[PDB]
Amino acid sequence: RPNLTWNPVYQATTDSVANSYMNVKKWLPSATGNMHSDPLICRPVPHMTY
Amino acid sequence: GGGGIGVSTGTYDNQTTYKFLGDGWVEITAHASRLLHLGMPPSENYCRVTVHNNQTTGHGTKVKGNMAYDDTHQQIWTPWSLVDANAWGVWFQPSDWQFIQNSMESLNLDSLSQELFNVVVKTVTEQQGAGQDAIKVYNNDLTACMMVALDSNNILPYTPAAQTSETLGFYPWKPTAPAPYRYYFFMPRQLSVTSSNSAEGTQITDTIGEPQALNSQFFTIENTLPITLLRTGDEFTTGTYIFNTDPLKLTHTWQTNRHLGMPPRITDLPTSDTATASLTANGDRFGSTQTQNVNYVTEALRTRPAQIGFMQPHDNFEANRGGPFKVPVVPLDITAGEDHDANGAIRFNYGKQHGEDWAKQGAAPERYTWDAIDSAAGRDTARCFVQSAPISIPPNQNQILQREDAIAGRTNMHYTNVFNSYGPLSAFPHPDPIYPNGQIWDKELDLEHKPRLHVTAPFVCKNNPPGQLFVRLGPNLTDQFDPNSTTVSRIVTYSTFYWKGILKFKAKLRPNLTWNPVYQATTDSVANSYMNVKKWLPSATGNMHSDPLICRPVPHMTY
Amino acid sequence: AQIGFMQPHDNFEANRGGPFKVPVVPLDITAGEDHDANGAIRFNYGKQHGE
Amino acid sequence: AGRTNMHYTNVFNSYGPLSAFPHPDPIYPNGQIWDKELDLEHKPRLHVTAP
Amino acid sequence: DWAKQGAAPERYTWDAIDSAAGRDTARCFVQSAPISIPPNQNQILQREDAI
Amino acid sequence: TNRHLGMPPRITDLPTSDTATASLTANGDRFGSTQTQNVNYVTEALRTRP
Amino acid sequence: GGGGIGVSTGTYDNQTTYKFLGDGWVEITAHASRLLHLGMPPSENYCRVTVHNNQTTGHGTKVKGNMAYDDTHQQIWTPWSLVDANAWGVWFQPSDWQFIQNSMESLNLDSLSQELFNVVVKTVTEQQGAGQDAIKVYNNDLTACMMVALDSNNILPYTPAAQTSETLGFYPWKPTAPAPYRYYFFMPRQLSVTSSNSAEGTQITDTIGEPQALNSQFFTIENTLPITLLRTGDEFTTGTYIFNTDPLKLTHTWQTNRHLGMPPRITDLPTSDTATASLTANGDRFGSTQTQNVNYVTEALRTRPAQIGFMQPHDNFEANRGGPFKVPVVPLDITAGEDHDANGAIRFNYGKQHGEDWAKQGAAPERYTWDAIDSAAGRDTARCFVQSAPISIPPNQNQILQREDAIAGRTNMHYTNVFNSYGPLSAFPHPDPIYPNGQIWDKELDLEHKPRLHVTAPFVCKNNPPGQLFVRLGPNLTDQFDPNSTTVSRIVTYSTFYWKGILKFKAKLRPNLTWNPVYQATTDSVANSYMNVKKWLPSATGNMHSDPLICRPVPHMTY
Ligand SMILES: CC(=O)N[C@@H]1[C@@H](O)[C@H](O[C@H]2O[C@H](CO)[C@H](O)[C@H](O[C@]3(C(=O)O)C[C@H](O)[C@@H](NC(C)=O)[C@H]([C@H](O)[C@H](O)CO)O3)[C@H]2O)[C@@H](CO)O[C@H]1O
Ligand SMILES: CC(=O)N[C@@H]1[C@@H](O)[C@H](O[C@H]2O[C@H](CO)[C@H](O)[C@H](O[C@]3(C(=O)O)C[C@H](O)[C@@H](NC(C)=O)[C@H]([C@H](O)[C@H](O)CO)O3)[C@H]2O)[C@@H](CO)O[C@H]1O
Ligand SMILES: CC(=O)N[C@@H]1[C@@H](O)[C@H](O[C@H]2O[C@H](CO)[C@H](O)[C@H](O[C@]3(C(=O)O)C[C@H](O)[C@@H](NC(C)=O)[C@H]([C@H](O)[C@H](O)CO)O3)[C@H]2O)[C@@H](CO)O[C@H]1O
Q1: Cβ F33 vs Cβ B188: under 8 Å
Q2: Cβ-based neighbours of B34, under 8 Å, separated by 6 or more
Q3: Which positions ≥6 away from G102 have C-beta within 8 Å?
Q4: What residues contact residue G227 under an 8 Å CB cut-off, 6+ apart?
Q5: In chain G, fewer beta carbons within 10 Å around the N or the C end?
Q6: Nearest Cα to B449, choosing from D14, E21, E19, D46?
């Protein structure tokens, strides 16, 4: 993608905030090995239409 | 050498040349030159300005039913200005338009080249005089520079000035000015839908939101475009853009679904010139219909190849995260019912530089409504009707949906307002060009899938539109400058520069194959006539006005 | 996607040339025998064409 | 609109970007074979009279 | 989630990331031409209007 | 959206304070194009969009 | 020919181009252009100025225990100014930084080129007006000249302005100014070490010394550098410097000594997701330790290959012939104890041109503390402890040196303050770059033996750094000039010139080999969030602020 905007752009990122849809814990294996893959965001960068 | 402060850096040329090539092909090269006045930007800072009309009185949005008066939005104000010349009037004398409309059958864009020359930057100083009437002295800042930028890759938001009537002037002998460049910035916007009859307690929700990262884009001319500094003896050239577009028909249609295919056979020829003719009994007549409950064929029930034109929802004020908006309507024939909104008539407001009578005093702008010249795809809402199948002719009050029929108990609401007949059989003409207050070319929308046509311009660049030309005056700093201070004392400075553009068109002479004489755009001397030549003649005081001219005067057979 | 589509019935639109039955894409009358809703084509012919 | 025999179906158009329909069937022997296209800058997807 | 016990399947609703082509039905409205601003209860088709 | 297409309306003057809004030219005196003729004013909502 | 007063002598270019070469290599060419305002030097004489704060009150050095407030020093003031652009913000939009941080894994300097163009020298004259409000008239001195010098051989003292926040502005649309060049001159300096609790009679020794030949060096730009006189139609070019430096990692580490090597084998897998696991009895566990008094192996006693990070003396105010100075500390992780000083956190104070909210009123500068993004080499002083050999676990109050233990009877003094664990096994990460208030490159110290790294910049030229650019306005003498007189009547004169620089970088795209999603630098719309996009968006009044952005967001395996 090209970068031509002064303002920083929104990017898909994980966090450590508790009960956060993006808590890395979700994409990490459990102690028993249980794994889950919740849907990830797409098209995070905006583009000018006109 | 070539560069010099005392030498001119360009040539004023404003003439439309016609080169007839052959087989009826015409190369129309339109030269346009204008003098531009640029001043210092009130601020040298990019600004995120918010406009919000929450007034609880007048045309505010806290007034029940003023939803349409919504002018709320956020925009990035830029110290840069824009030299936009995308309007038919900036490229052709009224006569040129007439010749093309009356003699040519097709017109397509070819190439565009633009040049900035003869830059003059001047400083204003005030000398003290008697009566305390300080005189203003204008001096030449030979070393001063004007910043010029061209966005060829079209990275910055496209802003056609024609819509705001902020394009260059339509009169080559009058000075002009560029338009301050500005672009919308996403801002959450929600406005409740109410009515003048809504309960007094009804609370209207007029709310604006804080910037959202997912949709926040801030661009600066400096961090995106290469900027050329222009001094008195400097010139700018934009090269030669090539237009890749679809040709525009200079002819109108007239054939409705009732004029498609072999007409019904008359029994016998009319007896007298004042006599009508008779067809075979509908029951005995041969033909094809799509209604089976009936055992007869009538011109109205006859199956036609397709649908010329289509019904369009009226005042469909849709609403997104950006507030309510009038859904655009394909410009078609208002018909004999003069149903402008039903057919998308375009009413535009303009100023003296764009054809308002210079004599006209008062701020009130000139307002003209453009009705499509087309006479084939229009819809007369008052005559349109829907019947119940199995078709029963004649029907009863409960077997037909006439327009007067109220919808949802709203007396003035009719199915026509919410009826969309667009389908795979809908066939309509393309928007007519509007000299001289009409945008010529337009940028396509970067959506994976796009609209069939744009209601604002007859031409849509099929790839990348001509680059926007940006101009600004640099801060003329004084002796006192604190880089850590917001305030920036600056020398009053203005600049004048000449702009020249060359727009080329590929047109083709129209064929003449009709016995009857054809309708042509002509002027007259009849008093109070929209075409009284006096209108396009200079006044005694020199006042000039250019009222819109007709287009597509010659009809062409549709089927 | 959508196989087929609903089509306005007896949309008699009107221009400068008078009223006209809007054509309907010929589709399946279905088990409801909805001919007009699906644009059934009824044609009238003479001896030279199969009468 | 209080019309007993009028139903939303009569004024309902579901044509959209997802609508997919077959093309008109030829009708031996009383059927037009070829047809002329309409000289409109933009044209219909198909003609109901000819395949 | 492998831990999630019970037959009940995992259910997720995907909302389009797009923020430009959506339609807020509650805010959408249709007015009568000739347009009269501000309109009266009989000059505007608000959503709450029953059909 | 359609409300973010084309050159925005010209603000009369820049906002005075960071907490201040801006004013446009009177809709009656404002220049522009609409598809509604029963009205003699141009409003961002009534503005003709491509 | 090419030279002319009316012709421009350069092009404004401020865009970051990204050229993807292959195998993931990226050529990042950063163009930066700024308008500079230069004024007449208050004096045209080089001056040996002495600063000495001997006040017996307030923040003076005759106050017991104000040793740290020492600002005493001698400097050679020069009529010359310096065009320094050694700061990350002067070369990249906030977005550019984010893209590089989130997508690239390495970054190295390549080449640097600088150009001075469009020189404009103007004179200020005052005309008498009513109300005795003399107006200031600004005229063009076409024949005036601006003196430019480049010290490529680096003979003059190196002065990175970034440290004084005196580099060029970080906003390309705002005018900027160079920084007055000045360099320290050796001056004997001795200050006694006292405490707020010292005896009232305690006499503090605050003494300064006379210049010492053994250490006296006076340099003048004129007698050391070739000077280029620049007139309105003149241009300066510094050529293309080539950077010979070591690449910078754009990734952080997380592995401490407790995360090095094969982990201990769990007896059995955890039973429930909420259950922990058990290892083999430390007595029966296999492994290697460096403590023999114990017959067991514990993760903490396990022998590790080396030492990730190291303890550093706190506030080691060492003292030479130049007075006391805070010994620098390798920037590391403040850890969960937030031990900033123990880990060398960098707190910097800057002004509007460098990211202070333009709205912020008051002289008070913006103050930000930079904590190293690293999470592996930090030291939590509160948790650190030293035990006595033969190791006795658990130890007694006399067998362990906990932090709270006072040293030399000073209650708040702890061994940690005087403990240095740097050794042959110490392994630490290199200083993180700090957009946008961070020095990029730095000069190496001409000592026969040099430091492993510099705490001020991520890049150290391994040979000779880019030459410093010096600019000054020549004395505009009047009619009255006495060469034998010290006083020099001069015409008020100021100059404005455009600076353009091209900095090129060799970067490499990061690899993705982890199942879990990776942490990326992102903005949000959450209210009062350090990353609320509103911060990097222009205000309604145009106020702009650039708060520091995170770096090295992606982690990399250390061992
Ligand atoms: C006569 C009738 O049955 N109804 C008219 C109706 O036509 C009229 O609408 C327009 O026509 C009048 C005719 O005088 C007038 O033109 C109106 O307003 C102006 C305008 O918008 O300012 C007057 C301007 O002078 C004119 N422009 C020029 C330079 O001639 C424009 C322009 O011609 C018009 O916008 C084209 O559509 O029209 C028109 O709105 C309305 C007026 O309320 O009602 C009856 O008078
Ligand atoms: C809070 C409010 O105003 N209204 C909520 C409404 O949002 C909620 O709908 C969803 O949100 C809740 C929030 O806890 C919950 O997520 C609901 O149901 C589940 C589901 O469908 O099973 C729970 C799942 O755990 C979740 N998936 C995972 C793995 O996290 C899914 C999924 O997030 C969701 O389908 C995405 O749309 O949601 C959601 O339906 C409804 C619930 O009745 O009403 C209020 O609680
Ligand atoms: C909350 C707690 O346990 N202790 C806080 C402690 O964090 C705080 O130190 C800093 O954090 C506060 C939080 O509001 C504030 O940021 C302090 O001072 C400022 C400053 O130095 O001027 C305020 C500025 O607005 C800010 N910069 C900007 C533009 O946001 C800077 C900057 O964020 C900071 O220097 C980064 O380290 O901080 C901080 O010093 C102290 C304050 O005494 O004690 C508790 O409040």
Answers
A1: no
A2: B85, B90, B168, B169, B172, B175, B176, B498, B499
A3: A11, G520, G521, G553, G554
A4: G147, G148, G149, G221
A5: N
A6: E21
Resolution in A: 2.6
B16: its two tokens: 């439309």
What would the two tokens of residue B386 be?
A: 């829907």
Chains E and C touch (3+ CB pairs under 8 A): no
Could you write out the three-class secondary structure of A8-32?
A: CCCCCCCECCCCCCCEHHHHCCCCC
For residue C24, the distance in angstroms to the closest alpha carbon of chain B comes to 8
Which residues fall within 8 angstroms of residue G215, CB to CB, at 6 or more apart?
Answer: G186
Structure tokens at G217: 């060096």
Tell how far CA B326 is from the center of its chain.
16
Distance CA G106, CA G510 (A): 8
> Which chains neighbour D (Cβ–Cβ under 8 Å, 3 or more pairs)?
B, C
Q: Is B343 helix (H, G, I), strand (E, B) or coil?
A: helix
Q: Are strands B468-473 and B146-151 parallel, antiparallel or unpaired?
A: antiparallel
Cβ of E1 and A49 within 8 Å? no
CA of C34 to the centre of ligand 2 (A): 43
Nearest to B179 by CA among F13, F14, G542, F10: F10
Contact residues for B336 (Cβ-Cβ < 8 A; gap 6+): B380, C16
Q: How far is CA G234 from CA G7, G148, G229, in A?
A: 10, 11, 9
Cα B229 from Cα B121, distance rounded (Å): 12
**Is G in contact with C (3 or more beta carbon pairs below 8 Å)?**
no
Residue B525 exposed, middle or buried by CB count within 10 Å (0-12, 13-18, 19+): exposed
Q: Give the DSSP H/E element, type plus range, for residue B97.
A: helix B94-103
Provide, as residue numbers in chain E, all residues whose Cβ is less than 8 Å from the Cβ of B315. 30-33, 35
Separation CA G76–CA G446 (nearest Å): 21
3-state secondary structure of B213: helix
Way the structure was solved: cryo-EM
Report the candidate in G436, C33, B187, G94 with the shortest Cα–Cα distance to residue A10.
G94
d(CA B442, CA B151): 15
- How many angstroms does the Cα of residue G338 sit away from the middle of ligand 3? 13
For G182, list phi and psi in degrees, rounded to 5. -155, 150
Mutate to test the interface with B, among E32, E41, E44 (most CBs of B within 10 A): E44
- Cβ–Cβ below 8 Å for F8 and B184: yes
Encoding tokens for residue G357?
């909210």
**C-beta separation of B78 from B173 below 8 A:** no
Q: Beta-strand (E) ranges in B331-420?
A: 346-350, 366-370, 385-387, 400-401
Selected residue of G29, G96, G496 to mutate for chain B interface (largest B Cβ count, 10 A): G496
Instruction: Please tell me whether residue E41 adopts helix, strand or coil conformation.
Output: coil
Burial class (CB in 10 A: 0-12, 13-18, 19+), B314: buried
G173: tokens are 């649309």
Angle at B292 between CA B288 and CA B298, to 5 degrees: 45
Residues with CB under 6 A from ligand 2: A 38; E 10-13
Q: E40–B215: do the CB atoms touch at under 8 Å? A: no
| b/e B236-254 (16+ beta carbons within 10 angstroms → b) | bebeebebebebbbbbbbb
Per residue, what are the HEC states of G336-405? Answer: CCCCCHHHCCEEEEECHHHCCCCCCCCCCCEEEEECCCCCCCCCCCCCCCEECCCCCCCCCCCCEECCCC
Q: Exposed (0-12), middle (13-18) or buried (19+): which is B57, by Cβ within 10 Å?
A: exposed
| E strand residue ranges, G174-250 | 179-185, 189-191, 206-208, 227-230, 236-242, 248-249
Non-local CB neighbours of G474 within 8 Å, separated by 6+ positions = G144, G145, G146, G147, G229
Q: Number of C-alpha atoms within 13 angstroms, CB side, residue B230?
A: 26
